[PDB]
Write a structure and sequence with these properties.
Largest sheet of chain A: 2 strands, antiparallel
Structural class of chain A: mainly beta
Organism (chain B): Chikungunya virus
Strand content of chain A: 25-35%
Subcellular location (chain B): Host Golgi apparatus, Host trans-Golgi network; Host cell membrane; Host cytoplasm; Host endoplasmic reticulum
Protein name (chain B): Structural polyprotein
Radius of gyration of chain A: 23 Å
Shape of chain A: elongated
Order of helices and strands of chain A: EEE
Subunit structure (chain B): Oligomer. Interacts with spike glycoprotein E1. Interacts with spike glycoprotein E2. The precursor of protein E3/E2 and E1 form a heterodimer shortly after synthesis.
Largest interface: A-B, 26 and 27 residues
Helix content of chain A: under 10%
PDB class: virus
Number of helices of chain A: 0
Oligomer: part of a larger assembly
Chain lengths: ~50, ~50, ~90
């Protein structure tokens, strides 16, 4: 809990390594077609200043 | 529509991804890691105590 | 403007066309490109408004002209491949 690298937090019952900042993680999300709206059916924007 | 993305193994940091399905208006998803748990498979050899 | 397009056997493309009409009436919709096909045969127009149309194409890069009533409009679309290689209906 105090000596492990990558800022590891050690928990018990069951024993486990929690929040170890090592590497990356790929996430795949299959969003349904019902959540999508067409470009033509979506509001278009003109005359923009920032 | 399948959206594949890679985020760093860092808990507490919010990451935003742009979902662009051709012909459809873009979508923005906010992802945040709350916990990353690594549980090892254990086998008890023995236990020690006071004699 | 093409917010969504997927080149497949069915109408996997969505297109929004902005216009300025003289009066209320019915106008015919037809693709002037032999590679793209529109699902809508006729729609209703009024004045300063828009219209949503469904289209089917095979090309990845699709530049097609849509003839609404008697005037033509150029559509720019970058369609993506579908999840299935074999389909259950002809096109």
């Amino acid at each position: 809990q105090h000596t492990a690298p990558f800022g590891c937090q050690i928990a018990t019952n069951p024993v486990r390594a929690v929040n170890c900042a090592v590497g990356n993680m790929p996430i795949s999300i299959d969003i349904p077609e019902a959540a999508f709206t067409r470009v033509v059916d979506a509001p278009s924007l003109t005359d923009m200043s920032c | 529509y399948e959206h594949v993305t890679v985020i760093p193994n860092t808990v507490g940091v919010p990451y935003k991804t742009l979902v662009n399905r051709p012909g459809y208006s873009p979508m923005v998803l906010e992802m945040e890691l709350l916990s990353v748990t690594l549980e090892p498979t254990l086998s008890l050899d023995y236990i020690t105590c006071e004699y | 403007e093409v917010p969504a397009c997927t080149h497949s056997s069915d109408f996997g493309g969505v297109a929004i066309i902005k216009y300025a009409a003289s009066k209320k009436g019915k106008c015919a919709v037809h693709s002037m490109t032999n590679a793209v096909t529109i699902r809508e045969a006729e729609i209703e127009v009024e004045g300063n408004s828009q219209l949503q149309i469904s289209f089917s194409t095979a090309l990845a890069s699709a530049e097609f002209r849509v003839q609404v009533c008697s005037t033509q409009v150029h559509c720019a679309a970058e369609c993506h491949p579908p999840k299935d290689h074999i389909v259950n209906y002809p096109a």
